[PDB]
Amino acid sequence: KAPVVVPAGVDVKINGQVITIKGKNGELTRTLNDAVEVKHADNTLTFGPRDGYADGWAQAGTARALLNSMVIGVTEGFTKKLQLVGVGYRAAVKGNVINLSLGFSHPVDHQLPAGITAECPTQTEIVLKGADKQVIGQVAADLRAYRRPEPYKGKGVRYADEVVRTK
Amino acid sequence: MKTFTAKPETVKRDWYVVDATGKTLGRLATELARRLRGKHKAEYTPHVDTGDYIIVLNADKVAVTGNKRTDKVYYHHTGHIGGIKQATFEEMIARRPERVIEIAVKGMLPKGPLGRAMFRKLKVYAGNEHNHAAQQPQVLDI
Amino acid sequence: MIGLVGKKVGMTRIFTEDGVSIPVTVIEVEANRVTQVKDLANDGYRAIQVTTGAKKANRVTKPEAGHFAKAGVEAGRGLWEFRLAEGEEFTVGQSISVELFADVKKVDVTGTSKGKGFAGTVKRWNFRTQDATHGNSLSHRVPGSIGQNQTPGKVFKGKKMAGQMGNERVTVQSLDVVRVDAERNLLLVKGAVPGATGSDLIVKPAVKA
RNA sequence: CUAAAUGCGGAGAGAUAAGUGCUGAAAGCAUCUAAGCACGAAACUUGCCCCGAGAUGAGUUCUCCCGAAGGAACGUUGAAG
RNA sequence: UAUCGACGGCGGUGUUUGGCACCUCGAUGUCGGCUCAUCACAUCCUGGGGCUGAAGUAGGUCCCAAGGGUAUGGCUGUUC
RNA sequence: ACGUCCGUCGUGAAGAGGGAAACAACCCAGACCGCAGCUAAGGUCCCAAAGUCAUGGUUAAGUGGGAAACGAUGUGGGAAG
């Protein structure tokens, strides 16, 4: 059993295999179904199976991690800061598609998954914030992925790329 | 030696039901499928139709043995090999029941051999009394 | 009435002031008696008849609808006496071409192109021919190569060859309707129309003109 | 009738491998995996054309019919053979 | 350790050759070519990738993969 | 080398019957006829006669065993510093 205390600005309610966390930033509902019973104590969320098998500890390490993740994503939130760079032709990054990358006539794009905001001010910094973590991390990774030289041209010579400043 | 009634066996066509509700699914494979060619009447021979359409009450509650689960698997599909396996679990296809107690009493054709014909006879479906609503003729109860 | 149908009579022409002289295919479009209409559904990609509408059946027309809204409905054909029709069934089934057909209107006419037995690769699926001296070598309509690598002495199923045909459906689009005239209620279609004379061809308001 | 003649012969959609990643333990770190998950091959499935109720889940519809409904035989010719 | 790669060691295949000779030995018309049908892969490319003594271009080598395409001619009966 | 060539012995040849999926020499075992009973080999979820038997443990690969030299924190058990 691994008791997980909940912040003063966090309210969690559970009904069966469904756990809902509420707060300021928003709400996140997740389902944890396994050979364990997750219950919420007035001051702490408890997770404790009956057996201590290896596989049982595996689901225990992820469960606690997921819960703690739902807590931070409600009080603080998930946001990644990225910056664009280019020595030569300025890469115009728009909320739709990036153009003039290294001088290529054709635009490189990627579909924005789920519902997160990627507001990009006319400068060097851009922000991708959302409620889901697996989403804000994918979109941020793909944005740099496409900035990766497809042809057989090594790095160093091609600086142009929008890397993530902070995780 | 020869004793056949006029063509065919449809006028005054017989019919029989069972209680799909509760009981082994094994001893439900036999019967039903024996009500067809040679229902057990002096009107068999064998070369013309006989298939005596049967009815299934409820096919959802029909529980299996309390041991065998993801033990038995059914391979359903056709076409090229080494592609789509489509291997689902029994109590997974239970989302029905429409294609279950008809997948059985279906494996005995054996291979045309008159059996294709044998299928539209019975009408598998989950429910109860108001299920036999469809098809409207006299009434029994085995 | 998604469209009408007639029988190919032959090919003529009409010189109209506007536009310019152009051959026209005469098609006999007449009285029909559609008793019912069969609707097909697109399960994956295998046609299947959903239901059939009789002189009076709201239980089938309802399913027909909605399914159309789902865009799952396939081509529509209805039990007819002479030729097809759609909304014509609901009325009485009895109708004339004059009821459905206007001229100068664009329409899509599809039909099965015109038994010819076995044919040569060329006369067959349009295979070209031995141009150059290749023709001089009197090897006109022959691929010259049943298949690569003599061993296998086999011809890749792909490697198209000769075979049987006749006894292909094609839907030519943008077919202007010159006019409806002749000894009998017919239709004048601009250009040519797939299939031989007497063949059954259908009409349909040009999807895009 | 033919050819050294002429008109016609898609796109698109769906799914894995190599591989690229996500979340994440066993080893409270890390990790593409071990459970789970997002993508990802001219080929594969489909589209499309052709055959097909002997398509063994062996079809559908309408009408006629159980002493008279219907049907075979013939004659004159083929858009047929 | 891009690439080439000895000495030595350990193996797979059985297309070559050698061996044995267990089988056939109560007879299944030769070689080459041609014509026509099916199968396989130790992929020469197309497709997707790794490395480079990879600037680019053009190549070299290697991996997954055989779906398709892998197809021809001049001299010689001739298979080099 | 389903090789040649010796020796001892049991068999193939007159070993039927039974098991081994099928099988000349591998295992058990060696026959008058008819009848009852009990066993051998082997087998006891179904086809197939007989337990889907009891206690305990391991494997997940369906491994159900050509499969080699060689390799292996896939996983389980035991002992030693």
Curated annotation (Swiss-Prot), chain A:
SUPFAM superfamilies: Ribosomal protein L6 (SSF56053). It holds the Pfam family Ribosomal_L6. One of its GO terms (biological process) is ribosomal large subunit assembly. GO terms for cellular component: cytoplasm; cytosol; cytosolic large ribosomal subunit. The modification N6-acetyllysine is found at K39. Disulfide bonds: none annotated. Keywords: Acetylation, Antibiotic resistance, Ribonucleoprotein, Ribosomal protein, RNA-binding, rRNA-binding. It comes from the Bacteria. Belongs to the universal ribosomal protein uL6 family. This protein binds directly to at least 2 domains of the 23S ribosomal RNA, thus is important in its secondary structure. It is located near the subunit interface in the base of the L7/L12 stalk, and near the tRNA binding site of the peptidyltransferase center. This is Large ribosomal subunit protein uL6. The gene is rplF.
Curated annotation (Swiss-Prot), chain B:
Gene3D superfamilies: Ribosomal protein L13. Keywords: Ribonucleoprotein, Ribosomal protein. GO terms for cellular component: cytoplasm; cytosol; cytosolic large ribosomal subunit; ribosome. The keyword Ribonucleoprotein applies. It holds the Pfam family Ribosomal_L13. GO terms for biological process: cytoplasmic translation; negative regulation of translation. GO terms for molecular function: large ribosomal subunit rRNA binding; mRNA 5'-UTR binding; mRNA binding; structural constituent of ribosome; zinc ion binding. Belongs to the universal ribosomal protein uL13 family. This protein is one of the early assembly proteins of the 50S ribosomal subunit, although it is not seen to bind rRNA by itself. It is important during the early stages of 50S assembly. Part of the 50S ribosomal subunit. This is Large ribosomal subunit protein uL13. The gene is rplM.
Curated annotation (Swiss-Prot), chain C:
One of its GO terms (biological process) is ribosomal large subunit assembly. Methylated by PrmB. One of its GO terms (cellular component) is cytoplasm. This is Large ribosomal subunit protein uL3. The modification N5-methylglutamine is found at Q150. The keyword Ribonucleoprotein applies. One of two assembly initiator proteins, it binds directly near the 3'-end of the 23S rRNA, where it nucleates assembly of the 50S subunit. It comes from Escherichia coli (strain K12). NCBIfam families: L3_bact.
